[PDB]
Amino acid sequence: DRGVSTFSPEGRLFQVEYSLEAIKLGSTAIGIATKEGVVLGVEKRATSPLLESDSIEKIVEIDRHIGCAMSGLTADARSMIEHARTAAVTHNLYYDEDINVESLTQSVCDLALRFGELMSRPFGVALLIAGHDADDGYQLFHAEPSGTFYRYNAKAIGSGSEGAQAELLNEWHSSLTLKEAELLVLKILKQVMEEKLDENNAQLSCITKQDGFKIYDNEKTAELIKELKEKEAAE
């Protein structure tokens, strides 16, 4: 057939480029970084009404100060999360301190290109890694299967990404509050989702310095959805 680590004539790794196509099929995940915190939101996308939606875990805690949202082949993310959690906790063991969000992201991205003929293929999932540390404050990273990670003020990944990213382009500014960011994620998710957005098919989360990483209750999110509807009807 052909090598797994083969370069195309354009100078790209075939398998890495093909895994990016799998990520485009995944459910939408959005992250927005502010000076009051970083917000992470995801589309759950249950395949059937009998599926208990609260078991869909696409937002995940890595440490008290680092959260993570995923999009694509979500089964591939489990070993990445596991490595991230181990890396975060191991650094606390060796250095008696929280680990930098960038360093954590770099550790996850080191796994990415460890494939050949090590694992047999790249990861088919993209990660939004959000967190806070004392050096660089509130941060949001986008970790790809290429081993590359970009920092972002706001970022959307998944099926409705390019539409959502264009929306995030206009809406984001450096003075956003946490409450404003929450509504903004809900707004953009509602826009790109196939089904109607509610507290059961969408999930919110945030990371603040004080309270750390928190996944929002369905009752808490439901109120933010109702607050969104009223403010859109206000003009």
Partner: protein, 222 residues
């Protein structure tokens, strides 16, 4: 039978101030009753405003210091030139020591610097990595000669306020760097008199927010 260990003598002392820290140690290196060197530096600037001394078996001390300096270098590479805090260095050194739990570094290590609030900090280690923060701690050959004196003159132990007769302790008033260096010098001068492995010279490294400074003082050469 081959004995992989040895004893190069030497004595070290770490004292933590309110906004400074000192790490002192004699410059004499010995085996048995012979002098190897009258000036062989034992306390080192390891970077990030941290000073370190691994007293006991010199070969193991030199290796540990070398590894920790290397650990500091890689901490900068791996974590965006972040400053290694004294508490983070201490924990790291524990893991360096315990990596040879079944063939230990035969050294009693002390580090000094400033904590993240800017206050003086000293940490002491045993050969297998048990560490703990301290205010005043001597290590090495003449540690038992020095520590009782510091208990009395730094922490004011067994000293009560005249007139009360044991009812009111002497108050724990903070010491300046100049007052501390006097106690350091008098400690080593007294140790030099009664311990044969202590003498020749005394090198002190003082750590402040401004950086790391050195001071050297001659000791008796007999």
């Amino acid at each position: 039978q081959f004995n992989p260990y040895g004893d190069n003598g030497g004595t070290i002392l770490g004292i933590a101030g309110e906004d400074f820290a000192v790490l002192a140690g004699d410059t004499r290196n010995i085996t048995d009753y012979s002098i190897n060197s009258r000036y062989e530096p034992k306390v080192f600037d390891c970077g990030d405003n941290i000073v370190m001394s691994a007293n006991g078996f010199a070969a193991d001390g030199d290796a540990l210091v070398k590894r920790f300096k290397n650990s500091v270098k890689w901490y900068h590479f791996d974590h965006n030139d972040k400053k290694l805090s004294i508490n983070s260095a201490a924990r790291n050194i524990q893991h360096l020591l315990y990596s040879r739990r079944f063939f230990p570094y035969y050294v009693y290590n002390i580090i000094a610097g400033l904590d993240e609030d800017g206050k003086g900090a000293v940490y002491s280690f045993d050969p297998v990595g048990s560490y703990q923060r301290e205010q005043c701690r001597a290590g090495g050959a003449a540690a038992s000669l020095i520590m009782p004196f510091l208990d009395n003159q730094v922490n004011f132990k067994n000293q009560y306020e005249p007139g009360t007769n044991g009812k009111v302790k002497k108050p724990l008033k903070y010491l300046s760097v100049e007052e501390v260096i006097k106690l350091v010098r008098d400690s080593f001068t007294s140790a030099t008199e009664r311990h044969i492995q202590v003498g020749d010279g005394l090198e002190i490294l003082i750590v402040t927010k401004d950086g790391v400074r050195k001071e050297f003082y001659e000791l008796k050469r007999d």
